[PDB]
């Protein structure tokens, strides 16, 4: 199928409580595989998947050097951004960065991205064409000009189209069992009486992968969102996902409602009814 | 593999 490799960085200043906390996480699709936490003791880029453990020691030295330097540029960015917005040195602020590349089913480069957030809001981002920038405010315009002068877009492009996809393909092969699987959802329906007349029909999807799923309810085979509850897809803790949809129903009428389950691991969409 | 290049805001 199509796949992606993504890195997420979060840097939080704590004025007068230590150097800023810095957390980096690496993902292939929905599966985490590396980790760095500046408050952890190891001070290393640690593995978080089994298939990444078969990298050599020189890989872990190199990722650790690159991630420790990431942390320091973010420590600097925090200072710069405080300046840019005329903020005090008492407030705790947040720098977020996300970058990655997507490959299609032939595993060839398809799309690249590099975005920054400051304080929960968009700051600057590479445009889909990987040649321009989208600066959010006036402050971000300053960074746009710094990076256009240094040709930063061009340089990111050579990582996104180069090392990024080429290492995404190596990870996809090393982890073929984990990463190329589709786990079809294990579905079932439950019935919980609320009153002596009203009932809850809950439609469950469990142990699936990837996380992309659709749950919808129908009444007499007609789409119904009224009186329904959807919870956000949640991680099971073992690398699969869960989700449920629920509809409150007048008792006696349960048999009119059908839950429908779409997931790419299913040859055909499931239909579930109360029985 | 993380990118080597470091940029500054």
């Amino acid at each position: 199928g199509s796949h992606s490799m993504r890195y997420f960085f979060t840097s939080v200043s704590r004025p007068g409580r230590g150097e800023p906390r810095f957390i980096a996480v690496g993902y292939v699709d929905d599966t985490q595989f590396v980790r760095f936490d500046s408050d952890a003791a190891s001070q290393r880029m640690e593995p978080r998947a089994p298939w990444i453990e078969q990298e050599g020691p020189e890989y872990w030295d190199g990722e650790t050097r690159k991630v420790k330097a990431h942390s320091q540029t973010h420590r600097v960015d925090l200072g710069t951004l405080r300046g840019y917005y005329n903020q005090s040195e008492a407030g705790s602020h947040t720098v977020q960065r996300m970058y990655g590349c997507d490959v299609g089913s032939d595993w060839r480069f398809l799309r690249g991205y590099h975005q920054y957030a400051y304080d929960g809001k968009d700051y600057i981002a590479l445009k889909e064409d990987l040649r321009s920038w989208t600066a959010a405010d006036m402050a971000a315009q300053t960074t746009k000009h710094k990076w256009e002068a240094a040709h930063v877009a061009e340089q990111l492009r050579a990582y996104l189209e180069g090392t990024c996809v080429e290492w995404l393909r190596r990870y996809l092969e090393n982890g073929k069992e984990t990463l190329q699987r589709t786990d079809a959802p294990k579905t079932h329906m439950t019935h919980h009486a609320v009153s002596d007349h009203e009932a809850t029909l809950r439609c469950w999807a469990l142990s699936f992968y990837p996380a992309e799923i659709t749950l919808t309810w129908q009444r007499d085979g007609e789409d119904q969102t009224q009186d329904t509850e959807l919870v956000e897809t949640r991680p099971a803790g073992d690398g699969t996902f869960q989700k449920w949809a629920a509809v409150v129903v007048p008792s006696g009428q349960e048999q009119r409602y059908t839950c429908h389950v779409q997931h790419e691991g299913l040859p055909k969409p499931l239909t579930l009814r109360w029985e | 593999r993380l990118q080597s290049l470091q940029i500054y805001v």
Epitope: A69, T73, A150, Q155, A158, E161, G162, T163 | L5
Partner: T-cell receptor, first 116, second 112 residues
């Protein structure tokens, strides 16, 4: 001069003494690098700063070497105590600080000889 | 993970003839820059020529050109119509995990 300034051109000290080399970056540059050149090891990166924050101090000798960048206009690299093995040419370079690929502009160096 | 190799420490060229200075390198990524630096006996480092690894065209600066062969990880420096002033140490260099890493350097002598 509007280049990298390095005080002083040469310096002879006796071992055991203190040694403090100073460097001023090109104005507007926000990133400063220290190197040392030897005939044995070549050019070795020592430490560098961006915005006066120490970004990497891998190559610093583990015990006798210290560096500060108190503000954007100057940086000191300090040796205490000096030992003959510290004799080298100590180069300072600056860059705009926008990216690690920015072109580095080098000072004339301070060649230090530490005599017994 | 980041090395620069200059195999010949001493090269000679006859004045006005051309000379090629060899350089190979190992790099772990695809976002790197390559550089040639000159150091005259004055010890001042001067940038001769810069190659961005994403650019395909070989970089040329007057009589200085490079043979950038990415797949071979080779980056030799061609000095044509060489001059007495070209006598110096030349250093191949790269930007990667570290912002500048220098090879061991080649001392070029220009026989007048």
């Amino acid at each position: 001069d509007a280049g990298v300034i390095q005080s002083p051109r040469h310096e002879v000290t006796e071992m055991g003494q203190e040694v403090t080399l100073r460097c001023k970056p090109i104005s507007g540059h926000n990133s400063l690098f220290w190197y040392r050149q030897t005939m044995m090891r070549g050019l070795e990166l020592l430490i560098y700063f961006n915005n006066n924050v120490p970004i990497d101090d891998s190559g610093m000798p583990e015990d006798r070497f210290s560096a500060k960048m108190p503000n954007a206009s100057f940086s000191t690299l300090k040796i205490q105590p000096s030992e003959p093995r510290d004799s080298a040419v100590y180069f300072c370079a600056s860059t705009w600080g926008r990216a690690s690929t920015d072109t580095q502009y080098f000072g004339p160096g301070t060649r230090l000889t530490v005599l017994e | 993970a980041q090395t620069v190799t200059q195999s010949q420490p001493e090269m000679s060229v006859q004045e006005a003839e051309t000379v090629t200075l060899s350089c190979t390198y190992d790099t772990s990524e695809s976002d790197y820059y390559l550089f040639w630096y000159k150091q005259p006996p004055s010890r001042q480092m001067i940038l001769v020529i810069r190659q961005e690894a994403y650019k395909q065209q070989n970089a040329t600066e007057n009589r200085f050109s490079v043979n950038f062969q990415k797949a071979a990880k080779s980056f030799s420096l061609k000095i044509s119509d060489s001059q007495l002033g070209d006598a110096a140490m030349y250093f191949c260099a790269s930007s990667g995990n570290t912002p500048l890493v220098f090879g061991k350097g080649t001392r070029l002598s220009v026989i007048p």
